């Protein structure tokens, strides 16, 4: 398999300001990658797919950038909504897989 | 405008099997491929198994490789996953995915079902 | 004097039943009346005859057919009228919707009683009327000859084909110069048709 | 032990090679006797259609196909005329060799014009149809007219009349004059209408394919 | 005199349709299929709808390369879907295997690749204008032209980043045709039906008055 | 009528196994054997059982690429190993090159490698059913059907990074078939033994009564 | 598409200072980019295209450079009809696209 | 010197349909490919269409796609746009552009005129 590790389990940041998170690729991946947004006891959410491009619908304060095995997820301003566990993914090859997961800190 | 749901989870003793089905409405169902997704309770996350939309291609990872068994019916708009011979680590929580292909994102997850392997 | 389509002579093709007898006979579908005003007909057939006669009855009750027919059109004006027709056979005729979406059935199958042109122009199928004479066709012209006859024989991919479905072919009479008659005399000038299918078949009772 | 030479690996749109099959030992389904086949575009050419001879301005349509006469009180008068160019943008458009003439770069070839008239049993008049070679302009009136090329057609013997033009390459004029007045006895309509009909000769050839502008 | 001949008049080939894969952006789906469209561009519809009933086997060509114009060696498979078959559900399906689906595998570095397809309908000839129903969408529609599919993919085995262009080119050989039919004036609105708009255009171009030339 | 002929019924070539070398990733190997197996598919196995007996000629064909669908060029090793020789142990091993063991030596920008096996068994026609013991996980096997086992490699010297995946066509030529068998029913198990199923299916499916048709 | 982001919605600077501004590109462009001067109520004017050439008639101030996928545009003396709208684009591929537009600063 | 003119512009209700008109001199017309582009409120500028110069390639975007229609006349050096169906964003103003080719930059661009989807 090909795995996918995530640098922080842990982010702190407040509301107004700006964090970006990182992925690290086992091996090259091209530009095939997605991002996830799980919130508390929910279903985990698409967002960033595929490099930049966003799925349908999320807002554009959302925005990721990368190429090869390293890549960034930037959200521009933080919000309160914006707290939950992020995660990536590899779909450049079967079986796909997922990082490990990385949460938000918003410290008042 | 779309639901996933899926039932049949719950305790199960070693061994045993269980069928873990899901329902969707409020799209054209033949057109999507579907997918299973077993979150670990470290909440680490992994695949389960995959079908194409018409029944094509049916991918299975290398773990769960021939001991669980995957179908769909287009007329119902089911999705059924047969699962058999369960240890201690196939106890997670389930959800009901949907792609438009094999190399895209799951953009959607039914709201997933628990299942527990214990004595 | 007679225009063979294409021509040739309808022939029986070497069990499908020859009806001969009482199919062969003409027959006289009703007088259309052309005015001033008035604009094109068409028929259609094999349909005209699916409700009429002993044929109707052979083409209703069997699953395929052959046939052939032979067509004679004739336009009865004294001599102090003008005007001039065409009438051509057009094979496989395939008309079309107008947009500001399809033809209504009634369009497509008219029946015995024919149709009138919403646009007789572009004969309502999209084509040119100047150039429609590449199909055999005969000058019906009030100073002359008052009289049009053809025989078209059975043109169509497969041998047999049902009548209730595919049409063979299509018939139209276009008035392409107007008619015009001094005060008092007789306003319509009738025209009438009449059809005698040759070398029929039919078989799968 | 072969050379290449320079010209191997191109493929040529124009290439008449030959290919595989791709289904070997597939049977299509054979032939059966359907009447009208027709070998080539030159056979089209030789049957006449009817003529736009009036196309002017809102003239509506099934209207633009034939020219109209009547008693004009005047017995000299130009009653109608059009080019002869087949290929060039005008009446003959509506043609049938006028259509596939614009498939073509070159033609060649005598045509053949023939007329018709509509107006009832009883009326009678003379027209003088004169044909003008292509290196001049058309006639001032008749007088100049009747001495070049020309037919008197009558009506009430004549009831349609063929004029062939001796020749074009790759433009020429024929005219329709008045020679006498239009007579009718009483109570009876007092124009007529008179229909065109082109057509091309059995010489008539083609050269260099192009697709058109019609389109 | 032998321009004019209607073996000569369809000969030449030309392009049918341009059909793309984009396994690369947005798209990541990996394969494409092309159901058969003669009637493509209106200009080759113009010239088929002439003749009524036509009789012919064509031959295919695929130019195919990158974005780029740039042709790096890399596989694809070409099948061939005869009619009547089931298609592709996705990049790995099993029916791009099976056995009856005749494929060319070509690599993009060689030059195209060229096939010959047989005379498939069932009657005696293709019907350009079917009257009378098949059995109102229904209304002159042929159910037996049907050609087949062309499905193509991209063998290397899991998202390359390159979307890949193709261009399909057909010449027709062997026609024969029947019962002429007189060009179309009016303009085209949709592909599979006549439908002419309600706004009429003259066939010819008007002048001044009846007499003025030129 | 040409068509329902048993030499063109069993014409087509196919895909009868697709190998992977993997010297890349956490398999090191280097290295493939791949037994000769009709029965791969059981598409293609249930054509054959339709006769008992058969004697052919086959024709085999390499696709190869890497995980990219690209074809850089890199040396490989095709060898045939016939019925009754030793296979190889390593990619190293000295039976990678003997004489007797026919090699084929195909860079992959080439275009395909192909070759053509002759007869092998010595029996007079192969067995699909061979009933009785070959001297109870014997019951019913051939042992005179092997047919050699296609070992292959890349000359490349020592661990190339690149997965070198395989595709493996054949067709029958010159096939001959005796007493013929009814197809199968019954859903497949295992590879070698027809065991079926407990629970039964039905030929037919079912309708409402002995009486009403659609 | 192939999305042209600005870095900066804002940049300050005075009267004889010198300015650079970037341009980012969601994919490689090649050398294809152009930028424009849009004055505040006016049509937006070309300046440079294609990386480093100008059209015809821009003062030579201005200056630019760049490949792939990272741009920049020079000004080697800012003046007071300097201060207006910079956008860059990509003519690399149909269809075309714009940055989100830069806004210079000019503080006394 | 060069003047690009427009004209139509102004406000509208849901779904009407206005033609642009766009009229030069001061150049041959004839040897330019023309387009249109509109500048929403936010200022961010996308293209609308373009036409070649002979009329042999017109290319929308696929926002716009087979909502509007383009078209040019050589001898009134006039670029026409067809636009029907308008929706909310369809709201800004537009100008009338210049180019050499497909891939050259816009060197000229008309004064440009507004265009509002309102009630």
């Known amino acids: 398999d090909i795995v996918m590790t995530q640098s922080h389990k842990f982010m702190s940041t407040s509301v107004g300001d700006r964090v970006s998170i990182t992925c690290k690729a086992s091996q090259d991946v091209n530009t095939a990658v997605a991002w996830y947004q799980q919130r508390p006891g929910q279903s985990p959410k698409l967002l960033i797919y595929?490099?930049?491009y966003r799925y349908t619908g999320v807002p554009d304060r959302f925005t990721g950038s990368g190429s090869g095995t390293d890549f960034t997820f930037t959200i521009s301003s933080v919000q309160a909504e914006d707290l939950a566990v992020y995660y990536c993914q590899q779909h450049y090859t079967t079986p796909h897989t997922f990082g490990g997961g990385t949460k938000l800190e918003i410290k008042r | 405008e779309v639901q996933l749901v899926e039932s049949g989870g719950g305790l199960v003793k070693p061994g045993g099997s269980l069928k873990l089905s899901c329902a969707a409405s409020?799209?054209?169902?033949?057109?999507?491929?579907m997918s299973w997704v077993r979150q670990t309770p470290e909440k680490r996350l992994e695949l389960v198994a995959h079908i194409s939309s018409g029944g094509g291609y049916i991918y299975y990872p290398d773990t769960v490789k021939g001991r669980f068994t995957i179908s769909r019916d287009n007329a119902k708009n089911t999705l059924y996953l047969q699962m058999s011979s369960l240890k201690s680590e196939d106890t997670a929580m389930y959800y009901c995915?949907?792609?438009?292909?094999?190399?895209?994102?799951?953009?959607?997850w039914g709201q997933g079902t628990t299942l527990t392997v214990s004595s | 004097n007679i225009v063979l389509s294409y021509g040739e002579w309808p022939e029986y093709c070497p069990k499908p039943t020859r009806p001969d007898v009482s199919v062969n006979r003409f027959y006289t579908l009703s007088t259309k009346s052309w005015k001033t005003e008035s604009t094109g007909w068409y028929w259609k057939f094999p349909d005209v005859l699916n409700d009429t006669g002993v044929f109707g009855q052979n083409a209703q009750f069997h699953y395929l057919y052959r046939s052939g027919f032979c067509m004679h059109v004739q336009c009865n004006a004294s001599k102090f009228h003008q005007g001039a027709l065409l009438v051509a056979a057009i094979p496989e005729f395939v008309i079309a919707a107008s947009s500001p979406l399809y033809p209504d059935f009634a369009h497509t199958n008219p029946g015995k009683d024919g149709q009138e042109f919403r646009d007789p122009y572009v004969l309502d199928a999209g084509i040119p009327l100047s150039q429609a004479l590449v199909f055999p066709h005969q000058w019906i012209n009030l100073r002359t000859n008052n009289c049009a006859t053809i025989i078209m024989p059975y043109v169509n991919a497969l041998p047999f084909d049902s009548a209730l479905n595919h049409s063979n072919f299509g018939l139209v009479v276009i008035p392409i110069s107007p008619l015009k008659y001094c005060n008092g005399a007789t306003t319509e000038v009738p025209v009438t048709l009449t059809i005698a299918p040759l070398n029929s078949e039919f078989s799968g009772l | 032990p072969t050379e290449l030479k320079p010209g191997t690996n191109q493929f040529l749109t124009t290439d008449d090679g030959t290919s595989p099959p791709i289904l070997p030992g597939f049977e299509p389904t054979p032939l059966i006797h359907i009447p009208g086949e027709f070998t080539s575009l030159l056979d089209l050419c030789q049957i006449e259609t009817i003529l736009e001879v009036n196309n002017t301005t809102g003239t509506i349509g099934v209207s633009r196909l034939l020219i109209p006469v009547r008693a004009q009180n005047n017995v000299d008068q130009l009653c109608a005329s059009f080019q002869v160019d087949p290929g060039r943008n005008g009446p003959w458009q509506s043609t049938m060799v006028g259509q596939i003439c614009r498939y073509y770069t070159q033609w060649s070839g005598s045509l053949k014009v023939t007329f018709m008239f509509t107006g009832s049993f009883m009326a009678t008049g003379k027209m003088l149809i004169a044909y003008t070679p292509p290196g001049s302009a058309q006639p001032a009136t008749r007088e100049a007219a009747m001495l070049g090329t020309h037919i008197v057609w009558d009506f009430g013997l004549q009831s349609s009349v063929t004029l062939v033009i001796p020749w074009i390459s790759n433009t020429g004029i024929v005219t329709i004059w008045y020679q006498t007045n239009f007579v009718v006895p009483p109570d009876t309509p007092t124009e007529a209408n008179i229909i065109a009909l082109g057509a091309a000769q059995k010489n008539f050839t083609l050269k260099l394919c192009k697709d058109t502008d019609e389109i | 005199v032998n321009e004019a001949s209607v073996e000569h008049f369809y000969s030449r080939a030309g392009l049918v349709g341009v059909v793309e894969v984009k396994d690369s952006g947005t798209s990541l789906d990996g394969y494409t299929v092309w159901p058969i469209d003669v009637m493509g561009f209106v200009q080759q519809r113009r010239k088929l709808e002439l003749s009524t009933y036509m009789r012919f086997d064509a031959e295919f060509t695929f130019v195919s390369n990158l974005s780029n114009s740039t042709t790096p060696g890399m596989l694809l498979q070409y099948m061939y879907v005869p009619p009547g078959a089931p298609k592709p559900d996705g990049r790995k399906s099993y029916q791009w295997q099976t056995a009856t689906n005749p494929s060319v595998f070509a690599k993009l570095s060689d030059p195209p690749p060229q096939v010959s397809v047989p005379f498939m309908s069932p009657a005696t000839a293709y019907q350009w204008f079917y009257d009378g129903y098949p059995t109102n969408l229904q209304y002159g529609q042929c159910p037996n032209n049907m050609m087949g599919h062309f499905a193509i993919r991209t063998v290397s085995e899991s998202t390359t980043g390159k979307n890949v262009h193709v261009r399909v080119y057909m010449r027709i050989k062997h026609v024969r045709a029947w019962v002429p039919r007189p060009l179309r004036s009016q303009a085209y609105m949709v592909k599979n039906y006549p439908t002419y708009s309600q706004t009429i255009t003259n066939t010819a171009t008007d002048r001044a008055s009846i007499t003025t030339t030129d | 009528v040409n068509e329902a002929s048993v030499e063109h019924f069993y014409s087509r070539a196919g895909l009868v196994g697709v190998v992977e070398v993997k010297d890349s990733g956490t398999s090191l190997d280097g290295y493939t054997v791949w037994p000769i197996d009709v029965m791969g598919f059981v598409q293609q196995r249930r054509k054959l059982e339709l006769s008992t007996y058969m004697r052919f000629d086959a024709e085999f064909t390499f696709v190869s690429n890497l995980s990219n669908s690209t074809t850089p060029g890199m040396l490989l090793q095709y060898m045939y190993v016939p019925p009754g020789a030793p296979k190889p142990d390593g990619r190293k091993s000295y039976q990678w090159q003997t004489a007797t063991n026919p090699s084929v030596f195909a860079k992959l920008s080439d275009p395909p490698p192909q070759v053509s096996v002759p007869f092998m068994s010595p029996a007079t026609a192969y067995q699909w059913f061979y009933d009785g013991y070959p001297t109870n996980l014997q019951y019913g096997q051939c042992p005179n059907n092997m047919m050699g086992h296609f070992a292959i490699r890349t000359v490349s010297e020592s661990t190339t990074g690149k997965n070198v995946h395989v595709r493996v066509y054949m067709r029958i030529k010159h096939v001959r078939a005796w007493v013929p068998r009814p197809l199968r029913s019954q859903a497949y198990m295992v590879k070698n033994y027809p065991t079926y199923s407990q629970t039964i299916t039905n030929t037919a499916t079912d309708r409402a009564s002995i009486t009403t048709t659609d | 598409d192939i999305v042209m982001t600005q870095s900066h919605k804002f940049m300050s600077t005075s009267v004889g200072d010198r300015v650079s501004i970037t341009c980012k590109a969601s994919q490689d462009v090649n050398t294809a980019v152009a930028w424009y001067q849009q004055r505040p109520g006016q049509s937006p004017k070309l300046?440079?295209?294609?990386?480093?050439?100008?059209?015809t008639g821009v003062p030579d101030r201005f200056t630019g450079s760049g490949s792939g996928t990272d741009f920049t545009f020079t000004i080697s003396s800012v003046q007071a009809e300097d201060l207006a709208v910079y956008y860059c684009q990509q003519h690399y591929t149909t269809p075309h696209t714009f940055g989100g537009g830069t806004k210079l600063e000019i503080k006394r | 010197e060069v003047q690009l003119v427009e004209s139509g512009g102004g406000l509208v209700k849901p779904g009407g349909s206005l033609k642009l008109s766009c009229?030069?001199?001061?150049?041959?017309?004839?040897?330019?490919?023309?387009?249109?582009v509109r500048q929403t409120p936010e200022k961010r500028l996308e293209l609308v269409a373009h036409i070649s110069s002979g009329g042999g390639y017109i290319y929308y975007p696929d926002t716009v796609k087979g909502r509007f229609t383009i078209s040019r006349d050589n001898a009134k050096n006039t670029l026409y746009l067809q636009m029907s169906s308008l929706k909310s964003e369809d709201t800004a103003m537009?100008?009338?552009?210049?180019?050499?080719?497909?891939?050259?930059?816009?060197?000229?661009?008309?004064?440009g005129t507004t265009l509002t989807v309102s009630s």
């Open positions: 995915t949907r792609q438009k292909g094999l190399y895209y994102g799951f953009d959607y």
């Open positions: 409020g799209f054209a169902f033949s057109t999507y491929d």
């Open positions: 595929s490099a930049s």
